[PDB]
Design a protein around this motif. Sequence first.
Motif, PDB file in Angstrom:
ATOM      1  N   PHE A 260     -80.592 -12.738 -34.033  1.00  0.00           N
ATOM      2  CA  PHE A 260     -80.196 -14.034 -33.516  1.00  0.00           C
ATOM      3  C   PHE A 260     -81.308 -14.614 -32.646  1.00  0.00           C
ATOM      4  CE2 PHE A 260     -75.567 -12.833 -34.213  1.00  0.00           C
ATOM      5  CZ  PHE A 260     -75.394 -13.743 -35.235  1.00  0.00           C
ATOM      6  N   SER A 261     -81.003 -15.723 -31.977  1.00  0.00           N
ATOM      7  CA  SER A 261     -81.951 -16.420 -31.117  1.00  0.00           C
ATOM      8  C   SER A 261     -81.199 -17.395 -30.221  1.00  0.00           C
ATOM      9  CB  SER A 261     -82.998 -17.147 -31.959  1.00  0.00           C
ATOM     10  OG  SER A 261     -82.376 -18.088 -32.813  1.00  0.00           O
ATOM     11  N   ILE A 262     -81.504 -17.404 -28.926  1.00  0.00           N
ATOM     12  CA  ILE A 262     -80.739 -18.166 -27.952  1.00  0.00           C
ATOM     13  C   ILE A 262     -81.718 -18.929 -27.072  1.00  0.00           C
ATOM     14  CG2 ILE A 262     -79.091 -18.000 -26.028  1.00  0.00           C
ATOM     15  CD1 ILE A 262     -79.242 -15.209 -28.567  1.00  0.00           C
ATOM     16  N   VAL A 263     -81.249 -20.027 -26.484  1.00  0.00           N
ATOM     17  CA  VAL A 263     -81.980 -20.746 -25.446  1.00  0.00           C
ATOM     18  C   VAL A 263     -80.994 -21.030 -24.321  1.00  0.00           C
ATOM     19  CG1 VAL A 263     -83.293 -22.788 -24.828  1.00  0.00           C
ATOM     20  CG2 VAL A 263     -83.608 -21.753 -27.075  1.00  0.00           C
ATOM     21  N   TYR A 264     -81.311 -20.584 -23.114  1.00  0.00           N
ATOM     22  CA  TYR A 264     -80.429 -20.803 -21.981  1.00  0.00           C
ATOM     23  C   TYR A 264     -81.242 -21.259 -20.781  1.00  0.00           C
ATOM     24  CZ  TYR A 264     -77.609 -19.748 -17.876  1.00  0.00           C
ATOM     25  OH  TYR A 264     -76.950 -19.822 -16.672  1.00  0.00           O
ATOM     26  N   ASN A 265     -80.726 -22.271 -20.086  1.00  0.00           N
ATOM     27  CA  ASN A 265     -81.373 -22.847 -18.910  1.00  0.00           C
ATOM     28  C   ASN A 265     -82.853 -23.111 -19.169  1.00  0.00           C
ATOM     29  OD1 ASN A 265     -81.446 -23.918 -16.352  1.00  0.00           O
ATOM     30  ND2 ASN A 265     -80.522 -22.128 -15.367  1.00  0.00           N
ATOM     31  N   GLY A 266     -83.130 -23.755 -20.300  1.00  0.00           N
ATOM     32  CA  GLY A 266     -84.480 -24.154 -20.641  1.00  0.00           C
ATOM     33  C   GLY A 266     -85.420 -23.032 -21.012  1.00  0.00           C
ATOM     34  N   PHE A 267     -84.916 -21.816 -21.200  1.00  0.00           N
ATOM     35  CA  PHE A 267     -85.744 -20.666 -21.533  1.00  0.00           C
ATOM     36  C   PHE A 267     -85.302 -20.103 -22.873  1.00  0.00           C
ATOM     37  CE2 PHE A 267     -88.763 -17.703 -21.471  1.00  0.00           C
ATOM     38  CZ  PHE A 267     -88.661 -16.562 -20.704  1.00  0.00           C
ATOM     39  N   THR A 268     -86.255 -19.911 -23.780  1.00  0.00           N
ATOM     40  CA  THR A 268     -85.951 -19.245 -25.034  1.00  0.00           C
ATOM     41  C   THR A 268     -85.585 -17.786 -24.770  1.00  0.00           C
ATOM     42  OG1 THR A 268     -88.223 -18.550 -25.493  1.00  0.00           O
ATOM     43  CG2 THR A 268     -87.583 -20.768 -26.154  1.00  0.00           C
ATOM     44  N   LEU A 269     -85.067 -17.132 -25.804  1.00  0.00           N
ATOM     45  CA  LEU A 269     -84.563 -15.776 -25.666  1.00  0.00           C
ATOM     46  C   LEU A 269     -84.357 -15.190 -27.052  1.00  0.00           C
ATOM     47  CD1 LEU A 269     -83.995 -13.910 -23.417  1.00  0.00           C
ATOM     48  CD2 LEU A 269     -81.654 -14.746 -23.277  1.00  0.00           C
ATOM     49  N   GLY A 270     -84.893 -13.999 -27.269  1.00  0.00           N
ATOM     50  CA  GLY A 270     -84.757 -13.331 -28.546  1.00  0.00           C
ATOM     51  C   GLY A 270     -83.998 -12.033 -28.387  1.00  0.00           C
ATOM     52  N   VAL A 271     -83.239 -11.692 -29.424  1.00  0.00           N
ATOM     53  CA  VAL A 271     -82.464 -10.458 -29.401  1.00  0.00           C
ATOM     54  C   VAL A 271     -82.987  -9.463 -30.434  1.00  0.00           C
ATOM     55  CG1 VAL A 271     -80.665 -11.470 -30.886  1.00  0.00           C
ATOM     56  CG2 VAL A 271     -80.155  -9.483 -29.482  1.00  0.00           C
ATOM     57  N   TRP A 272     -83.948  -8.641 -30.023  1.00  0.00           N
ATOM     58  CA  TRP A 272     -84.480  -7.628 -30.922  1.00  0.00           C
ATOM     59  C   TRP A 272     -83.431  -6.580 -31.252  1.00  0.00           C
ATOM     60  CZ3 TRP A 272     -90.070  -6.580 -28.727  1.00  0.00           C
ATOM     61  CH2 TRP A 272     -90.945  -7.491 -29.323  1.00  0.00           C
ATOM     62  N   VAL A 273     -83.409  -6.177 -32.518  1.00  0.00           N
ATOM     63  CA  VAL A 273     -82.482  -5.177 -33.027  1.00  0.00           C
ATOM     64  C   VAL A 273     -83.295  -3.978 -33.495  1.00  0.00           C
ATOM     65  CG1 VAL A 273     -82.450  -6.240 -35.319  1.00  0.00           C
ATOM     66  CG2 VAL A 273     -80.603  -4.719 -34.637  1.00  0.00           C
TER      67      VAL A 273
END
Length: 164
Positions: A76-89
């Motif tokens: 998946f891939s998320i952006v919260y409070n103006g910051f990207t975010l990746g979920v490595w599996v």
Amino acid sequence: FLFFNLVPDVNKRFNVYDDALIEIPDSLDFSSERRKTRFGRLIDGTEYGEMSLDNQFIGDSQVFIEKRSKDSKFVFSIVYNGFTLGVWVDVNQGLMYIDTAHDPSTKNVYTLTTDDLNENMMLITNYKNNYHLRKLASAFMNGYLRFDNQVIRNIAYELFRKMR
DNA sequence: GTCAGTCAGTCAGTCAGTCAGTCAGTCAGTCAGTCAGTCAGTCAGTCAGTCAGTCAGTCA
């Protein structure tokens, strides 16, 4: 510190840039004032045993929470409070990572804060993300999850707080 | 006593009628898993009494 995107240190006496300074005080005066507290009164010595005094002297870097990274990919891939975010599996053992690996892709990207909307990505409501990232939800509910960075770790904490 | 029969009991054969398991929509029930106003603290600002600083009406 989070806003200026600086990486502090706990041993370098001065973390300096072209414009700003981060100061952790000296070491000898730490011992001097701590023996002063101890000599004046012994419950002050207990305060010297209280981690609050240490945090007010050596600082809480929150480095205690698990931290690692691995070359394994992500879903998946998320952006919260103006910051990207990746979920490595991870291929094996399901050790989930929240490292900041944002590949520019047409892949599905999800947010929760309404300020984050793009022509490419999707919003999520009413706990659909619980039905999308089931393994992430369980992995955090388990010991599987591991956070790559302090900023990442906290940001994930507040994201979970906002999730419910 | 033969030729061998030709109009009732007889059994080889149903034949539509029969029971009730067995899934089955479905049923509102329901109870529980989600979510939307409710209030408490705290933030900014309104009252009407202080301080306590001061040009000045009756006199040196």
